[PDB]
From Swiss-Prot, chain A:
<keyword id="KW-0472">Membrane</keyword>
<dbReference type="InterPro" id="IPR018222">
    <property type="entry name" value="Nuclear_transport_factor_2_euk"/>
</dbReference>
<protein>
    <recommendedName>
        <fullName>Nuclear transport factor 2</fullName>
    </recommendedName>
</protein>
<keyword id="KW-0813">Transport</keyword>
<dbReference type="InterPro" id="IPR002075">
    <property type="entry name" value="NTF2_dom"/>
</dbReference>
<dbReference type="InterPro" id="IPR032710">
    <property type="entry name" value="NTF2-like_dom_sf"/>
</dbReference>
<keyword id="KW-0007">Acetylation</keyword>
<dbReference type="GO" id="GO:1904046">
    <property type="term" value="P:negative regulation of vascular endothelial growth factor production"/>
</dbReference>
<dbReference type="GO" id="GO:0005637">
    <property type="term" value="C:nuclear inner membrane"/>
</dbReference>
<keyword id="KW-0653">Protein transport</keyword>
<dbReference type="GO" id="GO:0051028">
    <property type="term" value="P:mRNA transport"/>
</dbReference>
<dbReference type="InterPro" id="IPR045875">
    <property type="entry name" value="NTF2"/>
</dbReference>
<comment type="subunit">
    <text>Homodimer. Interacts with RAN (GDP-bound form); the interaction is direct and regulates RAN nuclear import. Interacts with the nucleoporins NUP54, NUP58 and NUP62 (via FG repeats); recruits NUTF2 to the nuclear pore complex a step required for NUTF2-mediated GDP-bound RAN nuclear import. Interacts with CAPG; mediates its nuclear import.</text>
</comment>
<dbReference type="GO" id="GO:0044613">
    <property type="term" value="C:nuclear pore central transport channel"/>
</dbReference>
<dbReference type="GO" id="GO:0042802">
    <property type="term" value="F:identical protein binding"/>
</dbReference>
<dbReference type="GO" id="GO:0031267">
    <property type="term" value="F:small GTPase binding"/>
</dbReference>
<keyword id="KW-0509">mRNA transport</keyword>
Length: 124, 126
């Protein structure tokens, strides 16, 4: 597999393992200039992002990846786009779309730009 | 001073992109450069000429897209990244959700698409 899929796929396995288990380790994949758009709402900077992810109203969450597309950029970044499904506590499974822009800063691949959206919802 | 620069540039590009796609998709090569990368349904197309041939060959005569959601953010390199979630109706096929991502960059005073990733929904409703 290409190097952008290699890195890409490891990032999203890291990301979803941490979200699902210890999501107070999610701060380490973001820098201070990072931008998160969660369900149309914009959170700027590490502190605002880590506060938004820690405030989410659930105790247990599990994600599954249906498909993941990775691409190199001309400026040496990686774009990772995911389609999947999640189950928060005992609520119905919901679909989700999630997009990540990775940059290698100080010898580590960090997320500068993250956008998340729940699927449409056909009911409820 | 109001609405934000990434949202203005992104949203105008989205608008342009889907009007061209739904009217004449063969004029979509003007938005791409030589370094552009398209991922379409998991398949990987590098460069303008391979992207335009891919786009021109899709097997539909009429398409209509409708954007349910669009999220835009400036990046640290000064690019604009956009994520689109919506629906589409090609020919008389069922309505299908899609998701598309675009990376825009300002090269020689011109907003160009370097990176594009499209993926149809994997399930329908019928």
């Amino acid at each position: 597999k290409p190097i952008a899929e290699q890195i890409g796929s490891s990032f999203i396995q890291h990301y979803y393992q941490l979200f699902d288990n210890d999501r107070t380790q999610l701060g380490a994949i973001y820098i201070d200039a990072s931008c998160l758009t969660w369900e149309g709402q914009q959170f700027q900077g590490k502190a605002a992002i880590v506060e938004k992810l820690s405030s989410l109203p659930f105790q247990k969450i599990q994600h599954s990846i249906t498909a993941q597309d990775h691409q190199p950029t001309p400026d040496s970044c990686i774009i990772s786009m995911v389609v999947g499904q999640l189950k928060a506590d005992e609520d119905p499974i919901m679909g989700f779309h999630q997009m990540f822009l990775l940059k290698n800063i100080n010898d580590a691949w960090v997320c500068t730009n993250d956008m998340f959206r729940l699927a449409l919802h056909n009911f409820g």
